[PDB]
Every structure is written in structure tokens, then in C-alpha cells.
């Protein structure tokens, strides 16, 4: 019926962490290789690279992530990177346009623009469908941030070693979320469940992304357009 | 006293090759990460990467380069890349500004701009000094192109295997140059020699570059700003 002092300080450091790693003006977007309408690939690879940096910045501020071994910090960031990106992107996604609108007509990413980056419209439909659903949940900033931290700390991942310590951290976070909705969110009686279902949805979006990325990464003429960080984070190296 | 039909067709395919890989309008420069005044590093790494692509395109059209093994084609491109870049850059270098002027006030690279890309003004002075000298030679397009092809086909290089076949190719090119100056260049009686001296000069500029690049390449926060192609071409891998 009331969130504890420690559940509150977890919400605090997490929203502050998101505030320091997410710019609603999208100012830095001008430093990327320009969008061209695979003409969109250099801009979108620059965008994904910049976002991996922010996901890293955010992750480092999740209570307990820092305590983990360098190895587990990497295993989790590698596997969840694309999922955190897709979640955080919702903050820019509009239902009125069915696009990710980032402060400008040049940083407005519609389905057709993502197609000119190697990808197939058939594999783009589950992403926009996932983005419509997420937006329809009309999440509070605390819930959104909590969903990214729970997603990042997921145990079911290739390379993770301390599957007991991160399951512990994810549960302490799931606990903060479940209590937050009940206390602070009216009409949210079935929200916790609706959100956990989005984590599973993301796992499927992740597979489909990994397959599409594999296609690009093997063609050196496309791989060369990527950044060292994207190559490293999405690469198979152990 | 007269260039042979075969010395002429070597000049032809070489100037045509340079025409297809060098854009005097510098239009593609807008597709790079923007210049910022190490703020210049993303733009300059994008510039060097784009130029490696053009040097590759050019190399492929040098008569006899294509016949070489894939390995030697690589050994030569890796070692000479920076030198071909420095030579080809002269076409944009101005004596009136002491800068590389590329169709725009944003693509005007002065000494101070190159400093904000990791490099030290002390190691920049031999480059501009090399650029003043090269420009003072007032080379014909045929001589300039011939100098890049001779530079690329240099035998004294790490990794080269067929040191007899490329020395042969470089000499057949040196022959075309020496005859061209005598027949087609008035007051060039000491030009061939002045130019060969620039190849040696470049070798010193290359060492100094390799040392400076090593400094950047080891710091992952700087290396991440580079491109896959720059990393590959300037990397130690064999």
C-alpha cells in the first residue's frame, strides 16, 4: 500500500540516470552522417551507435549493475542493447504519424526510411506493431525507466555467468515496478502483466534483428558503413 | 625524344583513372560526419576513409596492379594509403591560404583544425612544408598521377612478396615519367629528381603518421570514432 524508502531511491537514481542519457531535443543528431532518402544505413548506424553509448551510460547508473563483473556487464549489454534501444525509442514514436519523430523533418524516421538501411518491410511490421502497443500502455516515466532496467537485468541471456545475482537485481526491480503501479497508477491493475509480456515480445524482435544484422555484417560493403561500437556490440566475439 | 604508343596508353588509363576517383567539387563531403571547431576526428576519419576508397579505385586501374596477387595488392595499399592521400590532397591545397580548400568554408582544413583530431602542431609542420614544395613543382596532371602510381608501386614495403614484379612495374612507370618531362615539360630538366625526393619525404611523413595513429588507435574512446576501413587499412593485422 506504500513504497519503501529504498524502492523510492531506486526510482530516483533510475529516472535521474534516464534524464542524463536521453535528450528530448535530439540535438546530437546533427553530428551523425546525414540521412539520405542502403542510403539510410550510415545515418541509422550512427544513430544506433550513439544510442548504445547512452544505454551504457544508463546501465552504469542502475543500482547494482556496477557491482557485477566486467564480463557480466558486457554479456548483458551485448544481448539487451537492441531491446533497450527499441524500448527507449518509444519516447519518440508518434501514433499520429506511425514514425519516430526526432526534432526535425530530416530526423523523422518512417517505415520506408528504415527499408533503405538493409531491412525488409515484412520484418519492420512487428516493430511498429510493438511501438503502437507500448505507446498505448501510456507509461509513466518511472514505469518506462523501470522496464528498461528490468529488460537490461534479464537472466535468460547468452554469456551471463552470475545468473543468481542478476535474477536477484531484476526481482528487486520487478518488486519496485509492481508496487509503483498499484500505489501510483490508477487503472493499472493489469499493467505489470501487459509490460512483462512486452519483454517476451522484445526477445522475438531481438531474434529477427540478429538475423537481419547477420545478413548485413557478412557483406563487407555494408559492414564497412557500421561503426566500431555497433560491430563490437552486435558481433559474435566472446 | 618521343613517347612510345604504350607509354602514351599508360598516361591515358592513369589520368582517366584519376578522373573517375577524384571529384574537384568535393560533393560527397556533405555525407561525412560534420566538421566541429577531438572534435575534428569524426569528420577527418570520414574524409580519410572516403579517400582510401578512391585510392583503391585508382590502384585497381593502374596497369598491372590488377595482375598482382590479392596479398600484394593489400600489402601495397596498406603501406602506401597515407602517402597517396597526402599526394592527392595537394590538388586541394592552396598557397594563398596554407590550407586544403574543399568547395566550402566548412571543408577548408587549416593547421588548427587538423590539431583538434588528435595531432600535434609540431608533427603538422612537415606536412604543410611538404604540401608547399609539391605545389611549387607546378606538376602537370600526367606527372601528378604518375607520381601516385610510382608511389603505390614502391617495392620497399612491409608485407610485399613479389618485390621483382612491382619493381618492374614501378620502373616501367618511372620510365614513362622521365620521358614525359623531357618531351612535354619545358624547364623540367631537374624535375624527375625533385619528385623522386618527394617519395623519400613521404616515407618520413608516413613514419610520423603511423606513430600518431598508434597513439589514437590504442585509446578505445578515440579508435571508436574511426571507421572499419581506416581501422583495417592502418591496423597491424597481417
Amino acid at each position: 500500500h506504500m513504497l519503501s524508502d529504498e524502492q523510492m531511491q531506486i526510482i530516483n537514481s533510475l529516472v535521474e540516470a534516464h534524464h542524463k542519457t536521453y535528450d528530448d531535443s535530439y540535438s546530437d543528431f546533427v553530428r551523425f552522417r546525414p540521412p539520405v532518402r542502403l542510403s539510410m544505413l550510415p545515418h541509422l548506424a550512427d544513430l544506433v551507435s550513439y544510442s548504445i553509448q547512452k544505454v551504457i551510460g544508463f546501465a552504469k547508473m542502475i543500482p547494482g549493475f556496477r557491482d557485477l563483473t566486467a564480463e557480466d556487464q558486457i554479456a548483458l549489454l551485448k544481448s539487451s542493447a537492441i531491446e533497450i534501444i527499441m524500448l527507449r525509442s518509444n519516447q519518440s514514436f508518434s501514433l499520429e504519424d506511425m514514425s519516430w519523430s526526432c526534432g526535425g523533418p530530416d530526423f523523422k524516421y518512417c517505415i520506408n526510411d528504415v527499408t533503405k538501411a538493409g531491412h525488409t518491410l515484412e520484418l519492420l511490421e512487428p516493430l511498429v506493431k510493438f511501438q503502437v502497443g507500448l505507446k498505448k500502455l501510456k507509461l509513466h516515466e518511472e514505469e518506462h525507466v523501470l522496464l528498461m532496467a528490468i529488460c537490461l537485468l534479464s537472466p535468460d541471456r547468452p554469456g551471463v555467468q552470475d545468473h543468481v545475482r542478476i535474477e536477484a537485481l531484476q526481482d528487486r526491480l520487478c518488486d519496485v515496478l509492481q508496487a509503483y503501479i498499484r500505489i501510483q497508477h490508477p487503472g493499472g491493475r493489469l499493467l505489470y502483466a501487459k509490460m512483462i509480456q512486452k519483454l517476451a515480445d522484445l526477445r522475438s524482435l531481438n531474434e529477427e534483428h540478429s538475423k537481419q544484422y547477420r545478413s548485413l555484417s557478412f557483406q563487407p560493403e555494408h559492414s564497412m558503413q557500421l561503426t566500431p561500437l555497433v560491430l563490437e556490440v552486435f558481433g559474435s566475439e566472446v | 625524344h618521343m613517347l612510345s604508343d604504350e607509354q602514351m596508353q599508360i598516361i591515358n588509363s592513369l589520368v582517366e583513372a584519376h578522373h573517375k576517383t577524384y571529384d574537384d567539387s568535393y560533393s560527397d563531403f556533405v555525407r561525412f560526419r560534420p566538421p566541429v571547431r577531438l572534435s575534428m576526428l569524426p569528420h577527418l576519419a570520414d574524409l580519410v576513409s572516403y579517400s582510401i576508397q578512391k585510392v583503391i579505385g585508382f590502384a585497381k586501374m593502374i596497369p598491372g596492379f590488377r595482375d598482382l596477387t590479392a596479398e600484394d595488392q593489400i600489402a601495397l595499399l596498406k603501406s602506401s594509403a597515407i602517402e597517396i592521400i597526402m599526394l592527392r590532397s595537394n590538388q586541394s591545397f592552396s598557397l594563398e591560404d596554407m590550407s586544403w580548400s574543399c568547395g566550402g568554408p566548412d571543408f577548408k582544413y587549416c593547421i588548427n583544425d587538423v590539431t583538434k583530431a588528435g595531432h600535434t602542431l609540431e608533427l603538422l609542420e612537415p606536412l604543410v612544408k611538404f604540401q608547399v614544395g609539391l605545389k611549387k613543382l607546378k606538376l602537370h596532371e600526367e606527372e601528378h598521377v604518375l607520381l601516385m602510381a610510382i608511389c603505390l608501386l614502391s617495392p620497399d614495403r612491409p608485407g610485399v612478396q613479389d618485390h621483382v614484379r612491382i619493381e618492374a612495374l614501378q620502373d616501367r612507370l618511372c620510365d614513362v615519367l622521365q620521358a614525359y618531362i623531357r618531351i612535354q615539360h619545358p624547364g623540367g630538366r631537374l624535375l624527375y629528381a625533385k619528385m623522386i625526393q618527394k617519395l623519400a619525404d613521404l616515407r618520413s611523413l608516413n613514419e610520423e603518421h603511423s606513430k600518431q595513429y598508434r597513439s589514437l588507435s590504442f585509446q578505445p574512446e578515440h579508435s571508436m570514432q574511426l571507421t572499419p576501413l581506416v581501422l583495417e587499412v592502418f591496423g597491424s593485422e597481417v
Binding site: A70, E232, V238 | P220
Partner: peptide
Amino acid sequence: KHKILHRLLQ
């Protein structure tokens, strides 16, 4: 292996 990730995580 993962030189950038390591630097960024420190």
C-alpha cells in the same frame, strides 16, 4: 575482445 565496451564501462 570488446575493447570499447570495457573502456565505456569504466
